Write a protein that binds this ligand. Structure first.
Ligand SMILES: [Ca+2]
Length: 110
């Protein structure tokens, strides 16, 4: 359930971006979920030559409810699992601390 907590942290733009990708995977599917047939076609389009066992094990790992297919909610958990600003937030903090330290040196001067 720990991966489901980070799903709610995703922005509206990230969820819409992932939905667009998911839609390409399920374009050939009648039930709106990714089966080995859809996965195999996508894998072959990307230049891969997967075996049937490879396709089944890929689906099985991200398939939480044993349906043999991947739905959008399971797809989102899979995306969050692979995403496990190092520069931006701490740098903006250090720059603010520096500007504050300069203002403190000024106002605090005798
Ligand atoms: Ca499933």
């Amino acid at each position: 359930d720990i991966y489901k907590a980070a799903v709610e942290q995703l922005t509206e733009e990230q969820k819409n971006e992932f939905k667009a990708a998911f839609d390409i995977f399920v374009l050939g599917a009648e039930d709106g979920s990714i089966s080995t047939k859809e996965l195999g076609k996508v894998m072959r389009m990307l230049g891969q030559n997967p075996t049937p066992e490879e396709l089944q094990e890929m689906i099985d790992e991200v398939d939480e409810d044993g349906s043999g297919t991947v739905d959008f909610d399971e797809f989102l958990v899979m995306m969050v699992r692979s995403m496990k600003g190092k520069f931006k937030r701490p740098t903006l903090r250090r720059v603010r601390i520096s500007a504050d330290a300069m203002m403190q040196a000024l106002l605090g001067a005798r």
